[model samples]
Target: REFAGLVLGYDPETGIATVQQRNHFRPGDEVEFFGPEIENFTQVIEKIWDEDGNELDAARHPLQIVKFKVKRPLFPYNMMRK
Candidate 1:
């Protein structure tokens, strides 16, 4: 698994993740989130959005919180891999 981003927040009801991106990732990519006390959760990226909720082609800004749709739940301070 390659390092992708740090999850800063997440929405359980919608499966949306607010992540501080460290690497390039876009829609249709598969990712896994893991950390202490968390299961190795896997999900496919469905969409990406900026903090303003506008759609993006990719999350390119380092450390910027990008909101993306995921299939599984992710947790804050967890690590994401691709």
Candidate 2:
């Protein structure tokens, strides 16, 4: 079965595309690749197609969505020392 995934990321300078889930992403997060410039978001992105490149139906995979919390802070600064 063939499926289509979503590419999330916005080029604010270009202003050509808008990401669906941008705020949800952070540094050190694990991501999946569907194409040259595509990243899977929690494995929730999905699409249905036959042998050919034709849009048949849209659906989600029957898999659990997993996300890990970063042990360290994203941006750690020594505030007390300052």
* Top candidate when judged by TM-score against the true structure: 1
**Model 2: per-residue Cα lDDT over 1-82, one tens digit each:** 2222233333344322222232233333343433333332232223323224343342223321212222122111101000
Count of steric clashes across candidates, in order:
0, 0
Please provide TM-scores, in order, for all candidate models, with all chains considered together. 0.85, 0.20
> Which lDDT tens digits does candidate 1 get at residues 1-82?
6788998988888778899888888888898889885878788877789888899888777777799876667677899898
Model 2: how far residue 26 lies from native, Å: 0.8
